Amino acid sequence: HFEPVTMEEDEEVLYKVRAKLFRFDADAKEWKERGTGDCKFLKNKKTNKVRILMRRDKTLKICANHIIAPEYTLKPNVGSDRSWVYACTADIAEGEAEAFTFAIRFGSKENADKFKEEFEKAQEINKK
Amino acid sequence: VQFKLVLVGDGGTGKTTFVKRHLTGEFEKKYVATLGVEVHPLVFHTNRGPIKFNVWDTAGQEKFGGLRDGYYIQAQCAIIMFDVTSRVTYKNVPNWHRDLVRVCENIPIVLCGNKVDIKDRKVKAKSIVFHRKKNLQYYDISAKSNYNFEKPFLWLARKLIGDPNLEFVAMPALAPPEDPALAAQYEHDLEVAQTTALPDEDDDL
Amino acid sequence: SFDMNELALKLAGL
Amino acid sequence: SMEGILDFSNDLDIALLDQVVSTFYQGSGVQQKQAQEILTKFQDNPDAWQKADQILQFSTNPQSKFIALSILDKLITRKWKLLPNDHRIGIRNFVVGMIISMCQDDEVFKTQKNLINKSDLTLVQILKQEWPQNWPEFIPELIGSSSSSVNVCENNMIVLKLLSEEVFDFSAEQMTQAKALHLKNSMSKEFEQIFKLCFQVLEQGSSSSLIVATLESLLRYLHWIPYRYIYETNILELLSTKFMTSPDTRAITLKCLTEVSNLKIPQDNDLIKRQTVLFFQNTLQQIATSVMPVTADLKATYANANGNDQSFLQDLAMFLTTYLARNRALLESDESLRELLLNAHQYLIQLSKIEERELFKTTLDYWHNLVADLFYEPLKKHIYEEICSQLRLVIIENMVRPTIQLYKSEREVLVYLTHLNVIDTEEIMISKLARQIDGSEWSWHNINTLSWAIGSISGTMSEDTEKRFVVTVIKDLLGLCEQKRGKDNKAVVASDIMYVVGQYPRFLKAHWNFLRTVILKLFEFMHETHEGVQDMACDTFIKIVQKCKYHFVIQQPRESEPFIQTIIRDIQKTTADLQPQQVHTFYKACGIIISEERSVAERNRLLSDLMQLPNMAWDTIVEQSTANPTLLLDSETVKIIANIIKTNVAVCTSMGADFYPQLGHIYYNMLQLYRAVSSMISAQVAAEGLIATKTPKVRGLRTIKKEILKLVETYISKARNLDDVVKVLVEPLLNAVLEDYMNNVPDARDAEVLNCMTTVVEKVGHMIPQGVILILQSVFECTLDMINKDFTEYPEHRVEFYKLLKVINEKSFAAFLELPPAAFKLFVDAICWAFKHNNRDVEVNGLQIALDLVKNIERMGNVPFANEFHKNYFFIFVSETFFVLTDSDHKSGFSKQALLLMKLISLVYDNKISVPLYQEAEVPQGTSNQVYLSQYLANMLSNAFPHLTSEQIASFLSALTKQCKDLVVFKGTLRDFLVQIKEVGGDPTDYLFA
Ligand SMILES: Nc1nc2c(ncn2[C@@H]2O[C@H](COP(=O)(O)OP(=O)(O)NP(=O)(O)O)[C@@H](O)[C@H]2O)c(=O)[nH]1
Ligand SMILES: [Mg+2]
């Protein structure tokens, strides 16, 4: 005989899409980027709750972390056919649950419509 | 576990914009000149635990120079920034480096050529050699397109910690949580936001 | 799909 | 409460200062920010220097003392000569005494290096002012005080280092030519004594800190000292042996020897050649015995990054490459020096394996220097056979994607290495290819790297061996593709096969049948939805066409027709699955082929058949969009139209002048479409506001306009028949775009209009004087008003605006003569406004327009318009040019500013301005413009820089004006002026330097 020498595991990926996230600075009436990377819909296996978790490329810093609440509503932006605007009341990407007016943009209108489709499917999952 | 980082370079080279990108993720289009210096804590998550950079974003304009080399005292690392669309900013690199190493005699230093996202590049890659004899790490970067934007901090992290295998890792994602008196409040902010056009709509993303 | 057989053919002659 | 230190009426509380300083450096958040704003206000106080003696004496905080010296530094640099003479001696005595006491306290000398270095630099600033004219015994006394104390001796080496830097390395920008030469000669005259001290310290030891500080100063000396101090002494022996053994001194010694390899050396003396060989021989010996043997894995050492290993390996690379690039010939003849030569290069081979891009670029530059010499120089390449063989593998294995800069450098060296030994290069590449097939080195990255390398040595071999090699490479690559399962692996290998063939056009041209099969296979890949394959197919198609176009246009043997016809017959089927951009590349590649057909009847027939699909789509849209215009509201129609135009742009880009027939097919309806689209954009902005310009519907509409403009610009820029351009294209074009631009609100004006017109004026502007006038009338005033409120808004319009004025000023200056005086006054305002930009694109054009305008006026001779121009605008251009020259915010434009200013001054001193430039009352009659010009400038500079003496201003202007025929000297005088205005009491005699 010879002797020899992230807290995302409990979840399932429902949807994944590349996107650029914006937050609305109301006091400046100006959109500000928050991050660019993969946006994922993560379903908890122990609660069946679906959330959005988005990380920036390279640094992998969280730029979005909130439940896809059934009360939220995706609105079009005046200057884009590949984006959605919606109010978020509890995002913990940067500490305490803060309220945000978010805008998320995609590579194509196809990706945006598909995002809207998955986003709504996820809402009905959280409804139960 | 925090390290002082001094960031120097000519005015308009994108020092402040670069740091802002790492802080909030936003891209500032406007050029508001820094007055003296701005200190910003910047934390990265690595496999060797978190590392904190106390970034001293100094002013590149002489009339806003402030304490100048007084900002360099007891810095443990540095970034020298210039603008590849502006030859003069690269011409002044030896001057920034000079004032820097006279105070900080032995520190890891990154030389960054910013704004490589702009087509009409003026400082050609073949011309950038100053870093060789001065033992500076060099990176082409772009605060706008995030090209190599993480490299300067990753390199400095590896040097400061003494681990060449150090890597940036994903921070833990906690489970997120779940009134009528603010129904009309958020509806006001929402409508103003829809009518405000998203910036850079010609961008790939 | 990916089938370079015709290239192998025309090259094996020449 | 921290703001107490800002009250100078009361005594300065040092304890309060130390708190504010601590709160800034060690504090955080709001308090830190508040302390920062207070310290800046304190330092910037013009009387703060007075309280510097208190801080440096009473404070216990080293940061406070540092800031005090910074306040003093500003005082010495800018206002020294303004002081009473007493204060000058006081500060000097105080700074000297301070440094002495810090050196005597071993505790302080040990733990306050930053404060002592700051003090030393402060001393050097005094020296630059006072030495040697008011301090002749500084160097003798410095050498004297060295023997007394090791700490003082060590610190003296730091002072001498800083001095040498300020005088020889950083003087060019910071002092006048005269002052620089003075200090250089002063150091040069007393260096004999300085070197003696330095050499004694090095030879006698023994404090490492003292030795290292001495070697650090020696490094600066080697930048300027005569070679005799290095070769006629024993100092090379010390560096290359004694100081290479100790790691403390090894780093700096190596940098010294690197600079010694750059000294000014007589290359006919055999003794010096021996010395140059010797210290290299000694250095490589110490490295082999003290650091690592030549076999050591430097790649692994570098990656481990222990201590200063990385810096050392970087410095070793710099030393070896520097020395060998200059002196390797010294080692090539002597048989006893052969081992040294090859060992030196073997270290470089090992160094080149390190994973570190910038280090690799450094070694690769050297390798290029070597293989290039072996390629031309007789009887040399056989010496380096084993080195070159290793290098082939190193470069092949580290080949990057075609940074493209690094690829070009890698290709270049590898092409040389292929010539030096073709058989060895082939063997290595096929060998590597075999290891890809047996899976021992199989990898997506590794197969790509090898394919890039094989493709880079194209057109270097014999046509015959090239063929034999390519066949071998492809045949083996073909087999590799079968071996792999899954489309992931298969896609990678298949792409590499298309890459290699696209790199060997000489081979494809010689074997039509194979080339034809290649292209048909690319068309199959245009249907593969696998990521990247479609792009890869299109890129390769056009790449092959660019190089083999002649074989697509001619009727090849065993063919009934030219292959271009076959491609067009199925162009719908081939491009059916491609994205719009990919379709445009396909059409552009067809345009490349068609343009080779020199039969006009045939070329135009091929062009018609190629454009059949977009022309039918076009005809259908124009017919249904004109009845009714509601169709354009549909996003689909807008996208379809934009794609049609883009296809015309793509074909026009490769066909140029030959595109004209196709342009004529659509031209008149296209301009009508431009009008229709324009009306809708205006209608939308009226009905929705300016926000409309952000909406997809309007951005879609504007895209049509921009592509139309791009198409016209593309053709006109390449047109050979300018008669048709003028008589057929221009008038309808101007009628369609100019009024629309003028009468739109600012946020709806397309900057592409300006760019298009720039192209029109460029090619045919000399033929349409009425047209150019119409262009100015429509875009000049309304565009200027967009951009003359800030330097920020409407950046595109700003850049194109001055490009347009530039070409108009060159090609049709008469258009500006027709301007009403008020409009011409705006033109002048616009040019100066361009000076004040930091924007390079705007500043340069502004300065060029000004220069060309002056030349335009000059060529008019003694005529009323030219004379009035000078009376109105000469001194405006002189003062405005001077302003940006001196305000320290436009340093990137110094040269052109200097040129413009030199031109303006020469006009007067060559008497090219016939009329007097002064009011008949303000100066006596008969006075020359030359005299009046001196007076104007003297008065101008006196009020703009009141701290300058009248003698300074007078000498400067006297020198400037007399040197207005010598640009390099003129610029010298301007640089000296820019230095003198930063300080008080500059020397007027400095301007007599030239
Ligand atoms: N196109 C492009 N612009 C950039 C980039 N980085 C910064 N900029 C722009 O450059 C300008 C100056 O940015 P800034 O951060 O203020 O430079 P700075 O070095 O901090 N200036 P100062 O020394 O006066 O504080 C801004 O308009 C910014 O948008 C870049 O990577 N690409
Ligand atoms: Mg700034």
PDB file of all heavy atoms in Angstrom, chain B residues 15-16 31-34 57-58, ligand 2:
ATOM      1  N   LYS B  15      -9.713  59.261 -15.504  1.00  0.00           N
ATOM      2  CA  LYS B  15      -9.423  58.716 -14.176  1.00  0.00           C
ATOM      3  C   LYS B  15     -10.692  58.582 -13.340  1.00  0.00           C
ATOM      4  O   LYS B  15     -10.971  57.519 -12.784  1.00  0.00           O
ATOM      5  CB  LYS B  15      -8.411  59.600 -13.437  1.00  0.00           C
ATOM      6  CG  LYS B  15      -7.078  59.738 -14.142  1.00  0.00           C
ATOM      7  CD  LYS B  15      -6.028  60.417 -13.278  1.00  0.00           C
ATOM      8  CE  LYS B  15      -6.379  61.862 -12.959  1.00  0.00           C
ATOM      9  NZ  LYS B  15      -6.445  62.708 -14.179  1.00  0.00           N
ATOM     10  N   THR B  16     -11.460  59.664 -13.257  1.00  0.00           N
ATOM     11  CA  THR B  16     -12.661  59.692 -12.430  1.00  0.00           C
ATOM     12  C   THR B  16     -13.747  58.797 -13.021  1.00  0.00           C
ATOM     13  O   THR B  16     -14.448  58.095 -12.287  1.00  0.00           O
ATOM     14  CB  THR B  16     -13.187  61.133 -12.275  1.00  0.00           C
ATOM     15  OG1 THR B  16     -12.169  61.942 -11.676  1.00  0.00           O
ATOM     16  CG2 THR B  16     -14.435  61.184 -11.392  1.00  0.00           C
ATOM     17  N   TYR B  31     -17.522  65.792 -18.414  1.00  0.00           N
ATOM     18  CA  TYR B  31     -16.203  66.018 -17.835  1.00  0.00           C
ATOM     19  C   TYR B  31     -16.272  67.099 -16.761  1.00  0.00           C
ATOM     20  O   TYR B  31     -16.113  68.283 -17.054  1.00  0.00           O
ATOM     21  CB  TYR B  31     -15.195  66.413 -18.925  1.00  0.00           C
ATOM     22  CG  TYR B  31     -13.805  66.769 -18.422  1.00  0.00           C
ATOM     23  CD1 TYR B  31     -13.386  66.430 -17.137  1.00  0.00           C
ATOM     24  CD2 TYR B  31     -12.910  67.454 -19.236  1.00  0.00           C
ATOM     25  CE1 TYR B  31     -12.125  66.761 -16.685  1.00  0.00           C
ATOM     26  CE2 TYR B  31     -11.648  67.789 -18.791  1.00  0.00           C
ATOM     27  CZ  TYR B  31     -11.259  67.440 -17.516  1.00  0.00           C
ATOM     28  OH  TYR B  31     -10.001  67.772 -17.066  1.00  0.00           O
ATOM     29  N   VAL B  32     -16.502  66.681 -15.521  1.00  0.00           N
ATOM     30  CA  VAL B  32     -16.406  67.579 -14.374  1.00  0.00           C
ATOM     31  C   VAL B  32     -15.061  67.364 -13.693  1.00  0.00           C
ATOM     32  O   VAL B  32     -14.840  66.335 -13.063  1.00  0.00           O
ATOM     33  CB  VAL B  32     -17.539  67.351 -13.359  1.00  0.00           C
ATOM     34  CG1 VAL B  32     -17.371  68.269 -12.165  1.00  0.00           C
ATOM     35  CG2 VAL B  32     -18.890  67.576 -14.012  1.00  0.00           C
ATOM     36  N   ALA B  33     -14.172  68.343 -13.823  1.00  0.00           N
ATOM     37  CA  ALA B  33     -12.807  68.216 -13.336  1.00  0.00           C
ATOM     38  C   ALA B  33     -12.760  67.978 -11.833  1.00  0.00           C
ATOM     39  O   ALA B  33     -13.472  68.622 -11.071  1.00  0.00           O
ATOM     40  CB  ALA B  33     -12.006  69.455 -13.694  1.00  0.00           C
ATOM     41  N   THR B  34     -11.917  67.037 -11.424  1.00  0.00           N
ATOM     42  CA  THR B  34     -11.692  66.753 -10.014  1.00  0.00           C
ATOM     43  C   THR B  34     -10.902  67.890  -9.372  1.00  0.00           C
ATOM     44  O   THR B  34      -9.969  68.418  -9.972  1.00  0.00           O
ATOM     45  CB  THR B  34     -10.933  65.421  -9.831  1.00  0.00           C
ATOM     46  OG1 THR B  34     -11.666  64.360 -10.459  1.00  0.00           O
ATOM     47  CG2 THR B  34     -10.735  65.090  -8.355  1.00  0.00           C
ATOM     48  N   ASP B  57      -8.369  59.374  -6.153  1.00  0.00           N
ATOM     49  CA  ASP B  57      -8.506  59.882  -7.510  1.00  0.00           C
ATOM     50  C   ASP B  57      -8.072  61.342  -7.550  1.00  0.00           C
ATOM     51  O   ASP B  57      -8.838  62.231  -7.186  1.00  0.00           O
ATOM     52  CB  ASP B  57      -9.953  59.725  -7.986  1.00  0.00           C
ATOM     53  CG  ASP B  57     -10.191  60.327  -9.353  1.00  0.00           C
ATOM     54  OD1 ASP B  57      -9.217  60.483 -10.121  1.00  0.00           O
ATOM     55  OD2 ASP B  57     -11.360  60.640  -9.662  1.00  0.00           O
ATOM     56  N   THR B  58      -6.838  61.584  -7.983  1.00  0.00           N
ATOM     57  CA  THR B  58      -6.280  62.933  -7.967  1.00  0.00           C
ATOM     58  C   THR B  58      -6.640  63.728  -9.218  1.00  0.00           C
ATOM     59  O   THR B  58      -7.120  63.182 -10.217  1.00  0.00           O
ATOM     60  CB  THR B  58      -4.742  62.915  -7.829  1.00  0.00           C
ATOM     61  OG1 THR B  58      -4.156  62.315  -8.992  1.00  0.00           O
ATOM     62  CG2 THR B  58      -4.330  62.151  -6.581  1.00  0.00           C
TER      63      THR B  58
HETATM   64 MG    MG E   2     -11.504  63.674 -12.427  1.00  0.00          MG
END
